[PDB]
From a paper:
Particular hotspots for the mutations are the angiotensin converting enzyme 2 (ACE2) receptor binding domain (RBD) (15 amino acid substitutions) and the N-terminal domain (NTD) (3 deletions totaling 6 residues, 1 insertion, and 4 substitutions). Most potent neutralizing antibodies target the ACE2 footprint (Dejnirattisai et al., 2021a; Lan et al., 2020; Liu et al., 2021b), occupying ∼880 Å2 at the outermost tip of the RBD (the neck and shoulders, referring to the torso analogy [Dejnirattisai et al., 2021a]) and preventing cell attachment. Mutations in Omicron knock out or substantially reduce neutralization by most of the large panel of potent monoclonal antibodies and antibodies under commercial development.
Broadly neutralizing mAb 58 binds at the front of the RBD, reaching toward the right flank in an area that is relatively clear of mutations and thus is unaffected. Q498R is between G496S and G446S, and G446 is in proximity to H1; together, these mutations knock out the activity of mAb 170. The binding sites of selected potent antibodies are shown in Figure 5E. All of these, with the exception of mAb58, are affected by the mutations in Omicron. To understand the resilience of mAb58, we determined the structure of a ternary complex of an early pandemic RBD with Fabs for mAbs 58 and 158, confirming that its epitope includes no residues mutated in Omicron.
Numbering used by the authors:
A (entry chain L): 3 to 214
B (entry chain B): 1 to 211
C (entry chain E): 334 to 516
D (entry chain H): 1 to 132, 136 to 219
E (entry chain A): 1 to 142, 148 to 229
The structure:
C-alpha cells in the first residue's frame, strides 16, 4: 500500500509545491512520479526517485530515499495543475499511489444560483426533475439543500460538479431533485438553499408550482 | 583513496647500494610489492610481501616494511639495474589496488658515447609519388640529449623537420631519429643535404646527394 | 581428501548473477553434514534428493554455482520460475537435481555509497537455456532503428547495477546464493 | 513518430469477453517490457499486466486468471485478452512501454471499457426554460435516462460555446445516466436569438435537437 | 608455459565502446585472481580493475568506476574488460596480470603479488581517422652496409617491423616513431649487414599495421 499525501492541494502560479509519497518500508530509491491532466494519458516526470526525465522542465525536482519520497515543483506554472501519482519501481506489484490533485488558488467567488421547474413535457411522462444550478464559484465546497414546503429533502437528489474552468478557475454545480408527478403536485413551494464561503448567509432560490 | 609516494628519481654509482622508499599511511600494516620495468618491456615482480623474492631474482634485491615507509634495497648495483620501479599495496578500505608514482633508477658513471648517424636519401618509389623524406637516424649515444640541425647546401633548414625525443635502448644507451619532409623539386634543386647531430659539444654530420 | 566446499561458500567475494561463476568439484569425499547442520542459511531447498541422505550417494560430477541477487529474487532460483533473474541471468531446468543454498549477506555486499561489484542483466531478446551464461555487453536495441554500439533512446545498456545499500529492506538486501548440481 | 494506438474498447455484459489491441510504431513490442494500465472513472492508476521481452507474463491479483497478455511480432501489436469480466473492471485501458525498472515513458491514448448488464437506451431531452435569471439569463437542457456513457451536447450546432457548462453525468438509482448542459446568455437576447441544444447518443443512434424557449 | 595473450585494442572514437580480452594458458585459470593495469605513454602504472577466481568484481579506479565492467569465463581461460563512454584520458597500454596470494585466491593465502604480465594491447581514444602507412625501401649506398624501410604517415600506434619473416634479427634496430605536425606517425627500421652479402641473401622488411589491416613486405635492394 502506497500512502500518498495530500489528496488535494491548492497552490498559486509560481509557488513551491511539495508532494509526499510514503512506503510501508524501505524501497531504497525505486520510485517514479507521473503527471496526468484530465482526459490525457499519464506523463512520466522522474524515475529512480531523483532523475528528471529528459524534456521535463527544471521545475520538477525529485528527492527522498528509504521510506519517504517527495516531488518538488520549484516554480509552479499554469500547465502544472494536474493530478500526480507515485509508483513503486522494481517490485512484483507495480503499486501506484492514490494521487495528489494540484488545483489553482484564486479569489473567493459566490455562485450564481438558478432554479428550474420541471418542464411541462416531462410532467406528461409521470416524473418531475427540479434542477438547481450553482454557476462559477470557488472553492469547490458547496452545500445544496432541497426544501419542499419547508421540508428538507434527502434521499432523492443527486448532484454533479464540473472541473475547474480553464479561464477563471471556477467550478459549477448542478443538483437534480427527482420526484414523480403526483408527489410533485402534492406540494407548492420548491426551493434549494445554497451555503458557500462567498455568501454572507445561505441564499435560496424558490418557485411555486403552477405560478409563472 | 589511498595514495603511495615514491621518489621520482634516484641515482647510485655502480657497486653501491640503492634505497627506494614507498611512503603511505600505516603502510607497515599492508603487504608491499615491488615491480621492475625496463624500457619498452612489461613489468616484472622482483619483491613481494615486504621481503620475499620470486625464483630467478638475484639475492641482491631486498625489501623492508616498517611503520609508514617501505623500502626497496638493491645491493651491488649493476648498469642493467637501471630501470623503473613501482611499489604496490592493497587498499582494503576503498577496495582498490594502488601503485606508486614510480622511481627512475639511473646508474651514474657511464662513459659518454658518440652518436652513430645514418642518413638515407629519398627512395625512388617516394619520388615517383611526388614526395620526398630524408631519414636521419641517431643511435648508441649517452647521455640522452642531442640537438639536430638540417642544412641545405650550406644554409640551415627549419621547416618540415620532425625529431623524436631520446629513448633509452636496451643497453642503457639512447636513440632518436629526425625526418625532413621536402618536395621532389627541393631535393633535386640543392646539391646536397646534411644532418648535423650535436652531442656534448661534439657534432657528427652526414651528407647525401641526389642520384 | 575432502571437497573444497569451504572455498565456495566462505569465499571472499561472489560474482554477479549475470556472470555467475561455476566451480567443478570431483575426486573428493563430500561431507555434507557441514552444510545441512548449519543454522546460518536462510534458504535451503533440495530438488530430487533428500538433504540428510546424500552422504551415502555418489555422483560423477558436482557443480557449484555462486552469485548474489536481491532477497526478493531468491525465489526465482528454482525449477519452473520466471523473472529477470530466471529468464535473463540464471535459469534452472525443470528437471533440476540438486540443492539451492542462500543466506543474507547485507553485512558483506552492501556499500554505503553504493556497490558497483554486483550487476544483473536487464534486457535480453530471449530467455536463457538451463545453465546458460551470458556475459555479453552488447547495446540492446529496443527500437526500430539500430544502435551501432551507442546508447540513447531505445538503445540501453543490457546490464544494471544493484547498488546494495545497508538501509534497504531485506527484499533489496544482497543474498549470496550457491547452487549445487548433481548428475 | 513514436506512438501507441489502442482499440477494441466497447460495452460488454459481466461474464463476457473482450480483446484489446495496441499497435506500435517507433517501438518494437517484442523487444520491450510492455504493460497494460487501467484507470477507473475518477480513480487512480492501476497496473494490470506485463509481458517481458523474453516472453514471460505477469498479472495483478485483481485480474489474475481472467486476463491474458500476448503480442504479435509480425504486426508489432500488443493484446490484452479479457474474459469473465466484472463491473469493477470498467476503466480506461492504456498500453505503455516499460523501461525495465518499472517506469513507463511511452503511453497510448487509451480505449474505454464499460462492463454493465444494463441495456442501451436513448435519452429524453427536456428544456430548462429561462425565467427570473438576474443580470443575465440562464437556460439549459436536461439529458435524462440514457445508457451507456457518453453523450455529446452542443448549442446552436456549435455557434454557442461561450458560457456553456456541460456537467458530468450522474448514475441514477434506476441504473440510467442523466446530466444537464446549461449556458448563460444576455437577458435582452431572450426574445430575439433562438437557442437549441444538440444531444447525440451514438450507442442508440439518437440525435435530438431541443428548442429551449422562455416559459410563459 | 605461462602466457597472457591480449587483443581487442585499437582506435576508438571518444564516447564509443571497446571490449578487451585476455587469454590464459598453461595454468589452472580458476585458481588465481586476474587484473587489468593500464599505462599511458611515459606515465606510471594505474590499476584498472580485477576479478577473483569466482568471477567476483573487486573494485575499480575512481576515473573508470561506473564505465568499465570486468568479467571472466573460467571455461575459456579468458578475462574481459568492457569499456564504455571512453575519454581521451583512457588512451593507454592495458596490461593483463595474474595474482598469487589470498583474499581473492582460491583459498586462505597471503599476497603473492602480480606474477606474470602480458605484453599489453594499446587503446587509442581519438576522433581522428585510421590511415594505413606507406612503406618505402631505404636503399643502401656503397665492411658493413646499412639498409632499412620507411614506414611513413600512419595512425594510430603501433606498427610491427620484422625482417625475412623474423629470420633476420642480428644487427636490426627499429627506431621509435615520430608524431608529425600533421597528426600522423612515421617509423623506420634499420639493419646492418656486411658489404659482401648484398647479392646473396635478400632482405625483406615485414610491416604490419593491424588497426588498418595493412601488411606490407618490401624488397630492399641496392639502387642503380
Ligand atoms: C565458514 O567459516 C566458518 C568460520 O569462519 C565456519 O564455522 C563454517 O563452517 C564455514 N562454512 C563452510 C561452508 O565452509
Ligand atoms: Na530503467
Amino acid at each position: 500500500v502506497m500512502t500518498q499525501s495530500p489528496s488535494f492541494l491548492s497552490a498559486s502560479v509560481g509557488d513551491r509545491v511539495t508532494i509526499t509519497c510514503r512506503a510501508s518500508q524501505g524501497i531504497s530509491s525505486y520510485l517514479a512520479w507521473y503527471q496526468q491532466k484530465p482526459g490525457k494519458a499519464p506523463k512520466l516526470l522522474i524515475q529512480a526517485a531523483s532523475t528528471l526525465q529528459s524534456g521535463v522542465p527544471s521545475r520538477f525536482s525529485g528527492s527522498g530515499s528509504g521510506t519517504e519520497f517527495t516531488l518538488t515543483i520549484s516554480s509552479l506554472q499554469p500547465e502544472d495543475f494536474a493530478t500526480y501519482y507515485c509508483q513503486q519501481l522494481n517490485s512484483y506489484r507495480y503499486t501506484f499511489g492514490q494521487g495528489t490533485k494540484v488545483e489553482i488558488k484564486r479569489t473567493v467567488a459566490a455562485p450564481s444560483v438558478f432554479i428550474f421547474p420541471p418542464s411541462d413535457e416531462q410532467l406528461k411522462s409521470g416524473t418531475a426533475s427540479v434542477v438547481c444550478l450553482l454557476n462559477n464559484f470557488y472553492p469547490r465546497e458547496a452545500k445544496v439543500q432541497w426544501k419542499v414546503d419547508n421540508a428538507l429533502q434527502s434521499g432523492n437528489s443527486q448532484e454533479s460538479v464540473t472541473e475547474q474552468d480553464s479561464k477563471d478557475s471556477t467550478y459549477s454545480l448542478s443538483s437534480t431533485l427527482t420526484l414523480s408527478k403526483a408527489d410533485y403536485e402534492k406540494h407548492k413551494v420548491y426551493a434549494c438553499e445554497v451555503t458557500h464561503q462567498g455568501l454572507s448567509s445561505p441564499v435560496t432560490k424558490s418557485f411555486n408550482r403552477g405560478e409563472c | 583513496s589511498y595514495e603511495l609516494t615514491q621518489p621520482p628519481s634516484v641515482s647510485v654509482a655502480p657497486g653501491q647500494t640503492a634505497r627506494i622508499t614507498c611512503g603511505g599511511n600505516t603502510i607497515g600494516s599492508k603487504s608491499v610489492h615491488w615491480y621492475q620495468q625496463r624500457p619498452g618491456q612489461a613489468p616484472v615482480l622482483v619483491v613481494y610481501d615486504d621481503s620475499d623474492r620470486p625464483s630467478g631474482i638475484p639475492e641482491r634485491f631486498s625489501g623492508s616494511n616498517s611503520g609508514n615507509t617501505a623500502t626497496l634495497t638493491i645491493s651491488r648495483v649493476e648498469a642493467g639495474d637501471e630501470a623503473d620501479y613501482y611499489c604496490q599495496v592493497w587498499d582494503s578500505s576503498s577496495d582498490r589496488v594502488v601503485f606508486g608514482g614510480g622511481t627512475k633508477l639511473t646508474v651514474l658513471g657511464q662513459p659518454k658515447a658518440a652518436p652513430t648517424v645514418t642518413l638515407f636519401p629519398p627512395s625512388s618509389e617516394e619520388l615517383q609519388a611526388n614526395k620526398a623524406t630524408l631519414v636521419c637516424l641517431i643511435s648508441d649515444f649517452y647521455p640522452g640529449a642531442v640537438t639536430v640541425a638540417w642544412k641545405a647546401d650550406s644554409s640551415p633548414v627549419k621547416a618540415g623537420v620532425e625529431t623524436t625525443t631520446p629513448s633509452k635502448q636496451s643497453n642503457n644507451k639512447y636513440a632518436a631519429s629526425s625526418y625532413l619532409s621536402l618536395t621532389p623539386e627541393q631535393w633535386k634543386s640543392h646539391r646536397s643535404y646534411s644532418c648535423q647531430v650535436t652531442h656534448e659539444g661534439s657534432t657528427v654530420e652526414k651528407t647525401v646527394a641526389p642520384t | 581428501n575432502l571437497c573444497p566446499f569451504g572455498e565456495v561458500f566462505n569465499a571472499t567475494r561472489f560474482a554477479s548473477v549475470y556472470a555467475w561463476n561455476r566451480k567443478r568439484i570431483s575426486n573428493c569425499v563430500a561431507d555434507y553434514s557441514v552444510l545441512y547442520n548449519s543454522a546460518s542459511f536462510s534458504t535451503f531447498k533440495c530438488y530430487g534428493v533428500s538433504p540428510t541422505k546424500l552422504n551415502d550417494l555418489c555422483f560423477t560430477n558436482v557443480y557449484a554455482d555462486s552469485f548474489v541477487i536481491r532477497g526478493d529474487e531468491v525465489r526465482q532460483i528454482a525449477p519452473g520460475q520466471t523473472g529477470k533473474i530466471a529468464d535473463y541471468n540464471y535459469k534452472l531446468p525443470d528437471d533440476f537435481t540438486g540443492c539451492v543454498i542462500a543466506w543474507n549477506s547485507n553485512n558483506l555486499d552492501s556499500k554505503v555509497g553504493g556497490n558497483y561489484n554486483y550487476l544483473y542483466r536487464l534486457f535480453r531478446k530471449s530467455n536463457l537455456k538451463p545453465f546458460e551464461r551470458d556475459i555479453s555487453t552488447e547495446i540492446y536495441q529496443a527500437g526500430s532503428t539500430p544502435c551501432n554500439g551507442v546508447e540513447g533512446f531505445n538503445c540501453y545498456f543490457p546490464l544494471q547495477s544493484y547498488g546494495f545499500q545497508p538501509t534497504n529492506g531485506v527484499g533489496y538486501q544482497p543474498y549470496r546464493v550457491v547452487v549445487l548440481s548433481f548428475e | 513518430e513514436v506512438q501507441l494506438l489502442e482499440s477494441g474498447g466497447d460495452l460488454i455484459q459481466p461474464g463476457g469477453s473482450l480483446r484489446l489491441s495496441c499497435a506500435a510504431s517507433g517501438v518494437t513490442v517484442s523487444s520491450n517490457y510492455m504493460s497494460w494500465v487501467r484507470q477507473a472513472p475518477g480513480k487512480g492508476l492501476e497496473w494490470v499486466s506485463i509481458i517481458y521481452p523474453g516472453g514471460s507474463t505477469f498479472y495483478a491479483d485483481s485480474v489474475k486468471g481472467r486476463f491474458t497478455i500476448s503480442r504479435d511480432n509480425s504486426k508489432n501489436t500488443l493484446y490484452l485478452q479479457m474474459h469473465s469480466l466484472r463491473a469493477e473492471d470498467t476503466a480506461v485501458y492504456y498500453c505503455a512501454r516499460d523501461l525495465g525498472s518499472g517506469d513507463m515513458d511511452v503511453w497510448g491514448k487509451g480505449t474505454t471499457v464499460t462492463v454493465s448488464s444494463a441495456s442501451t437506451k436513448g435519452p429524453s431531452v427536456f428544456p430548462l426554460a429561462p425565467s427570473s435569471s438576474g443580470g443575465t439569463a440562464a437556460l439549459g437542457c436536461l439529458v435524462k435516462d440514457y445508457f451507456p456513457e457518453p453523450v455529446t451536447v452542443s448549442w446552436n450546432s456549435g455557434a454557442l460555446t461561450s458560457g456553456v457548462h456541460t456537467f458530468p453525468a450522474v448514475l441514477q438509482s434506476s441504473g440510467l445516466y442523466s446530466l444537464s448542459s446549461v449556458v448563460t446568455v444576455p437577458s435582452s437576447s431572450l426574445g430575439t436569438q433562438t437557442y437549441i441544444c444538440n444531444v447525440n447518443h451514438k450507442p442508440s443512434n439518437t440525435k435530438v435537437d431541443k428548442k429551449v424557449e422562455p416559459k410563459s
